[PDB]
């Protein structure tokens, strides 16, 4: 979280928290209620976000859902949707934490290895997250949307 990050830097330097570090904690805790609201909205609309983004993805990449393609077949298609749901849940965790530590450990470190074994194309998983961003952003107020956007963008960057 914001807390964890601040403390870890202080502990390494063997010191109490700086005024700057304290200020960042203050700002974060003020934002908390707003962050929880953003997360709640996305949680409620989860099924819609995944599905509409999924549809756009299949339109954008017909091949994956084609007999030649990897995603072809209903079971395979379900798994691709399940994956999108997992990634959406991760994003919400990030927003409430105010940092990526939770996201990073659960979903990005070692991600290159796993998908490559499966043969699922990552140069397309990122696109699915982009898709999800567009849908999710439309259910949020402008200020809220921007906050949410950062976390979505981080995921796209990390892949």
């Amino acid at each position: 979280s914001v807390l964890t990050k601040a403390i870890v830097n202080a502990d390494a330097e063997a010191r109490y928290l700086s005024p700057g570090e304290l200020d960042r904690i203050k700002s974060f805790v003020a934002s908390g209620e707003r962050r929880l609201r953003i997360a709640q909205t996305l949680t409620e609309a989860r099924e819609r976000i995944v599905k509409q983004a999924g549809d756009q993805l299949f339109q954008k990449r017909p091949d994956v859902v084609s007999p030649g393609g990897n995603a072809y077949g209903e079971k395979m298609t379900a798994l691709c949707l399940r994956d999108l749901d997992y990634y959406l849940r991760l994003v919400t965790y990030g927003i409430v934490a105010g940092d990526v530590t939770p996201i990073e450990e659960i979903g990005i470190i070692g991600v290159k290895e796993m998908y490559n074994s499966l043969q699922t194309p990552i140069p397309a998983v990122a696109e699915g997250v982009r898709a999800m961003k567009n849908v999710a952003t439309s259910l949020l107020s402008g200020d809220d949307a921007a906050e949410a956007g950062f976390y979505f963008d981080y995921l796209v960057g990390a892949m």
Binding site: E47, K51, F58, Q59, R61, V65, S66, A78
Partner: peptide, 26 residues
């Protein structure tokens, strides 16, 4: 079980056929 995904995925496949679109450079 991914049951919700299983029914939604087939619903999506039935509503639209991906096997004709062809990739678009855009």
């Amino acid at each position: 079980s991914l049951g919700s995904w299983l029914d939604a995925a087939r619903d999506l496949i039935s509503q639209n056929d991906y096997s004709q679109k062809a990739i678009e450079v855009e």
